[PDB]
Amino acid sequence: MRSLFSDHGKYVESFRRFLNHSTEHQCMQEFMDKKLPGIIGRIGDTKSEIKILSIGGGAGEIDLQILSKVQAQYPGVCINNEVVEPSAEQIAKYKELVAKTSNLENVKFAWHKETSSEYQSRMLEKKELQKWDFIHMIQMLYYVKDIPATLKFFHSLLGTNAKMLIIVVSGSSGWDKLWKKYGSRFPQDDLCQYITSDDLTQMLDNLGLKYECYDLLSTMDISDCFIDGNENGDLLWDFLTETCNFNATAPPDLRAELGKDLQEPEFSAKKEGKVLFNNTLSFIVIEA
Numbered sequence: 537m538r539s540l541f542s543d544h545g546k547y548v549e550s551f552r553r554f555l556n557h558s559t560e561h562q563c564m565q566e567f568m569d570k571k572l573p574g575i576i577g578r579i580g581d582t583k584s585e586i587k588i589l590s591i592g593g594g595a596g597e598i599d600l601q602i603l604s605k606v607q608a609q610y611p612g613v614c615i616n617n618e619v620v621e622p623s624a625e626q627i628a629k630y631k632e633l634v635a636k637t638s639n640l641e642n643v644k645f646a647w648h649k650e651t652s653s654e655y656q657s658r659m660l661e662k663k664e665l666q667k668w669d670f671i672h673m674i675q676m677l678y679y680v681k682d683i684p685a686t687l688k689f690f691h692s693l694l695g696t697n698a699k700m701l702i703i704v705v706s707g708s709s710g711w712d713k714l715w716k717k718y719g720s721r722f723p724q725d726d727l728c729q730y731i732t733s734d735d736l737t738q739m740l741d742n743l744g745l746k747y748e749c750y751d752l753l754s755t756m757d758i759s760d761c762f763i764d765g766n767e768n769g770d771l772l773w774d775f776l777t778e779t780c781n782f783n784a785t786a787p788p789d790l791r792a793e794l795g796k797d798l799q800e801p802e803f804s805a806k807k808e809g810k811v812l813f814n815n816t817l818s819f820i821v822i823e824a
């Protein structure tokens with residue numbers, strides 16, 4: 537039983553089934569349209585340049601939505617958007633997207649193929665720390681080894697009136713229930729750990745930082761998960777379990793258990809002839 541984190545194989549294909557089967561994207565887009573404006577309201581006050589740091593930037597969809605809200609709030613102001621991302625593949629697509637968008641003149645990008653850790657250490661070696669007006673870590677803390685040091689570090693880079701935004705699954709989502717109850721019966725991949733908003737808020741309370749946490753409901757249609765032999769439903773099985781071919785490798789005593797739970801009022805809600813795994817997201821805003 538190997539971790540789906542296999543890398544650029546079943547991972548990607550399973551991920552895709554996750555996107556085209558959940559409101560993951562719409563959920564974040566809804567937050568950027570209704571809450572982001574208020575949040576970035578003063579990050580550029582008194583400045584002739586706005587510095588934005590994207591950790592785990594990814595492909596850039598949401599990144600681009602963020603810039604747009606920042607731009608309408610600060611017409612004419614140059615923006616400097618740096619991106620910290622380890623995967624060349626992700627960087628390639630991010631670049632492609634930029635070259636197709638046309639409202640990006642006052643915006644200059646720079647991409648760095650490295651991890652947030654390499655960034656952290658490599659920046660602790662130079663001179664004094666460069667400050668940022670806005671930093672964001674969207675769905676990537678799962679891949680960080682030392683979360684506390686990471687949160688203390690990046691918070692120390694926040695300039696005057698600056699804000700840091702972080703997004704992970706909610707402590708009240710199905711994932712939370714899925715990991716607590718079956719977390720150890722799933723392949724241990726030291727490349728990623730389980731993290732919910734509960735864990736994050738406790739680490740933030742302990743670090744003594746001031747934050748605000750908003751939850752927003754999202755779902756993942758796992759209807760194909762109850763249709764024996766459904767090849768797509770099997771795909772979702774791999775993403776959830778973080779295991780390749782979960783259906784054909786997992787103890788008959790394991791899956792048999794999951795079936796009953798992936799339907800309970802804690803894991804998923806049922807309606808319209810559908811089963812919707814709870815994908816609630818958390819948006820934490822950390823003040824400088």
Ligand SMILES: Cc1nc(N)nc(N)c1-c1ccc(Cl)c(Cl)c1
Nearest residue numbers: 675678705711728729730731778
């Ligand atoms: C929920 C989730 N959501 C997103 N947007 N990306 C992910 N990579 C995960 C995920 C899936 C399985 C495990 Cl084991 C862990 Cl740590 C994280």
Ligand SMILES: CN(C)CCCCSC(=N)N
Nearest residue numbers: 591592620651652676679
């Ligand atoms: C979707 N998934 C393959 C990989 C994401 C890694 C961003 S890692 C970082 N900045 N330490």
